[PDB]
C-alpha cells in the first residue's frame, strides 16, 4: 500500500511564514502527517531566537506555544482519519542545533530523552528529523562538521533503540548529489528508519529555471553542470547509494519559485575567477521586481510562492500579468511575465494537478513507497493533496 505524507507547517518556518489553523485542517487524503516544526536548544553563536539560547536545556527539543497548542488538538484530527499516523518534524530549513545535539553520546541521550517525553505526552506515532544539512551546514547557514555524518547515524540508531519498534522514525534528505555521497550514510541508516522522504524540489537556483522538474527540458536548459537537477536524477542518485525504492517517498512542493537566474548572474564554479565571469545574465529589470513587490514578494529576500497564491494572486490577476505555460519535457507548468518590449520572460515553475498526477504516475511506475508534500498551508482547499490521493490510489 502506498503512502502520502503531508507536512503541516503549524509552527512557522523561515521560508513560508506564520502557521495555519489546525481546526480547519482536512486530513482524510493522507496516511501520515508531519507536524512541523520542533526546534533544538543550541549554543550556535548566530542563533537569533532567544527561546533556544537557554544553556540549561541545551540539546533538548523546544516546542513553541503554537506548536504546543496545536499538538493538544490531535485527537480531533484522528476523528477524521483513524488510521492516520502523526509525527513531529524537528528541524527545517535554517534550524540550528543538530550538529551539537548529535555530537556526543551525552548530547544524543539528552535529545533522545526529550523526544520521548514529547511523544509520550502528545500521543504521537513517531518523530521525523529534518537536518538541513549535516557536514555541509546548508552552505554555512547552520553549524556543521565532518563528524556530522557518522554522528547522525549514531543518533538515529540510539533513537530507534529508545523509541522501540512500533513508533515511527523517519528523515528528510536533500536533492544535492553530494548528500548520499558524503552528508548522510544511506546504507547505514535505512535499516533503522521506516522510510526516508526525498526533498525533490528547490532546484530553481544557479543557472536552472525549474524548481521541481521531473525530467530535464531542452526548452529551458540549465547551463552549469553543477546546477543541473531533476526529480528523476535525485531519485536515481539515492538508488545508486543503496536506498531501496520501497523505503523512499518522492517529495512534491505545492509551491513555485522565481529562479535566481532571473535576478542574479549565474556562475559556473568550475571556471577560473568564476565569481566575476558569469555564464548567464539576469533578465528581470526593476519593473518586474516592482510587479512582484506589489503582490507582497521581495525578491531580494525570498523567491517562494505558494500554490494558493499562484492561483489566487497570479493566475487570477485582474491585470492578467502572468501567463500559464506547460513544459512537456520537464512535466511542470510555469508562468511568464511581459518584458518592457512585449516578450514573455520565465517567472516561475510550480506544480498543478496535471504535474502532480504525472509524479503520482512516476511513483507507481518506479515502485517508490509514496509521496511526501510540502505543505498543507500552501495548497488551495486541498486541491493538490486530493489529486495526489486520487492518482496514487489511496
Q: Which CATH number fits domain 254-350: 3.30.450.20, 3.20.20.70, 2.60.40.1120, 3.10.50.10?
A: 3.10.50.10
Alpha carbon of 344 to those of 88, 286, 316, 325: distances in Å?
42, 16, 18, 11
From CA 134, how far away is CA 72, in angstroms rounded?
31
Using the CB atoms, write b or e for 158-185: b if 16+ within 10 Å: bbbebbeeebbbbbbbbbbbebbeebbb
Owner of C-alpha cell 541521550: 109
From CA 297, how far away is CA 294, in angstroms rounded?
7
Sign of CA dihedral 41, 249, 30, 256: positive
What is the rounded end-to-end Cα distance, in angstroms, of the chain?
A: 8
Could you tell me where the beta strands, DSSP code E, fall in the chain? 3-9, 32-40, 61-62, 85-91, 126-130, 168-173, 195-198, 248-253, 255-257, 304-306, 322-327, 332-338, 344-349, 370-374
SS3 240: helix
Residues β-bridged to residue 373: 6, 252
SS3 2: coil
From CA 164, how far away is CA 293, in angstroms rounded?
50
Map 105-166 to HEC letters. HHHHHHHHHHHHHHHHHHCCCEEEEECCCCCCHHHHCCCCCCCHHHHHHHHHHHHHHHHCCC
**Domain spans, the chain:** 1-253+351-394, 254-350
Could you tell me where the beta strands, DSSP code E, fall in 174-247? 195-198
> Taking CA 204 as the corner, what is the angle to CA 203 and CA 209, rounded to the nearest 5 degrees?
120
Alpha carbon of 25 to those of 70, 78, 391: distances in Å?
11, 11, 21
Helix 105-122, helix 148-163: angle, nearest 10 = 40
> Taking CA 213 as the corner, what is the angle to CA 279 and CA 288, rounded to the nearest 5 degrees?
55
From CA 149, how far away is CA 142, in angstroms rounded?
15
Map 281-330 to HEC letters. CCCCCHHHHHHHHCCCCCCCCCCEEEHHHHHHHHHCCCCCCEEEEEECCC
Q: Are 292 and 263 in contact (CB under 8 A)?
A: no
Map 121-136 to HEC letters. HHCCCEEEEECCCCCC
Question: What's phi and psi for 49, nearest 5 deg?
Answer: -85, 110
Owner of C-alpha cell 513544459: 327
Q: Which grid coordinates belong to 389?
A: 490521493
From CA 275, how far away is CA 156, in angstroms rounded?
39
Q: Are 107 and 101 in contact (CB under 8 A)?
A: yes
From CA 41, how far away is CA 62, in angstroms rounded?
6
Alpha carbon of 157 to those of 153, 184, 349: distances in Å?
6, 13, 38
Q: Which grid coordinates belong to 32?
A: 501520515
Q: Which grid coordinates belong to 58?
A: 541545551
DSSP state of 346: E
Alpha carbon of 108 to those of 55, 239, 247, 267, 334: distances in Å?
16, 29, 25, 39, 44
Nearest alpha carbon to residue 305 among 389, 215, 201, 208 = 201
Q: Which grid coordinates belong to 246?
A: 520501497
Q: How was this structure determined?
A: X-ray
Within 10 angstroms of residue 318's Cβ, the number of other Cβ atoms is 5
Nearest alpha carbon to residue 157 among 136, 171, 139, 177 = 171
Q: Which grid coordinates belong to 161?
A: 533503540
Classified by CATH at the fold level, domain 1-253+351-394 comes out as TIM Barrel (3.20.20)
Nearest alpha carbon to residue 258 among 351, 349, 379, 374 = 349
Q: Are 84 and 77 in contact (CB under 8 A)?
A: yes
Q: Which grid coordinates belong to 274?
A: 568564476
Amino acid at each position: 500500500p502506498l503512502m502520502s505524507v503531508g507536512y503541516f507547517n503549524g509552527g512557522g518556518d523561515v521560508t513560508a511564514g506564520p502557521g495555519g489553523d489546525i481546526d480547519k485542517l482536512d486530513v482524510r487524503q493522507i496516511t501520515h502527517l508531519n507536524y512541523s516544526f520542533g526546534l533544538i536548544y543550541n549554543d550556535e553563536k548566530d542563533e537569533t531566537n532567544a527561546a533556544l539560547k537557554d544553556p540549561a536545556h541545551l540539546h533538548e527539543i523546544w516546542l513553541s506555544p503554537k506548536v504546543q497548542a496545536d499538538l493538544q488538538k490531535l485527537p480531533a484530527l484522528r476523528k477524521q482519519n483513524p488510521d492516520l499516523k502523526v509525527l513531529l518534524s524537528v528541524g527545517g530549513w535554517g534550524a540550528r542545533g543538530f550538529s551539537g545535539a548529535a555530537a556526543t553520546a551525552e548530547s544524543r541521550a539528552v535529545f533522545i530523552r526529550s523526544a520521548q517525553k514529547i511523544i509520550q505526552q502528545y500521543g504521537l506515532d513517531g518523530i521525523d528529523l529534518d537536518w538541513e544539512f549535516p557536514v555541509n551546514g546548508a552552505w554555512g547557514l547552520v553549524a556543521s562538521q565532518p563528524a556530522d555524518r557518522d554522528n547522525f547515524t549514531a543518533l538515529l540508531k540510539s533513537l530507534r533503540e529508545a523509541v522501540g519498534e512500533q513508533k515511527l522514525v523517519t528523515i528528510a534528505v536533500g536533492a544535492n548529489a553530494e548528500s548520499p555521497k558524503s552528508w548522510v550514510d544511506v546504507k547505514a541508516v535505512a535499516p533503522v528508519l521506516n522510510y526516508i522522504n526525498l526533498m525533490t524540489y528547490d532546484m530553481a537556483y544557479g543557472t536552472q529555471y525549474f524548481n521541481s522538474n521531473l525530467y530535464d527540458s531542452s526548452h529551458w536548459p540549465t547551463v552549469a553542470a553543477a546546477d543541473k537537477y531533476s526529480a528523476d536524477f535525485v531519485v536515481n542518485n539515492y538508488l545508486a547509494a543503496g536506498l531501496k525504492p520501497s523505503q523512499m517517498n518522492l517529495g512534491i512542493g505545492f509551491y513555485g519559485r522565481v529562479p535566481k537566474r532571473a535576478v542574479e548572474p549565474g556562475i559556473d564554479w568550475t571556471k577560473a575567477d568564476a565569481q566575476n565571469n558569469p555564464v548567464t545574465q539576469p533578465y528581470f529589470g526593476p519593473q518586474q521586481i516592482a510587479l512582484f513587490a506589489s503582490l507582497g514578494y521581495d525578491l531580494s529576500k525570498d523567491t517562494y510562492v505558494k500554490y494558493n497564491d499562484i492561483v489566487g494572486k497570479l493566475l487570477n490577476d485582474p491585470q492578467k500579468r502572468f501567463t500559464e505555460h506547460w513544459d512537456d519535457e520537464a512535466k511542470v507548468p510555469w508562468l511568464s511575465v511581459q518584458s518592457a518590449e512585449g516578450k514573455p520572460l520565465f517567472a516561475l515553475s510550480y506544480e498543478n494537478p496535471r504535474s502532480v498526477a504525472i509524479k503520482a504516475d512516476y511513483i507507481k511506475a518506479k515502485g517508490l513507497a509514496g509521496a511526501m508534500f510540502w505543505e498543507y498551508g500552501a495548497d488551495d482547499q486541498n486541491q493538490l493533496a486530493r489529486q495526489l490521493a486520487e492518482s496514487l490510489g489511496i
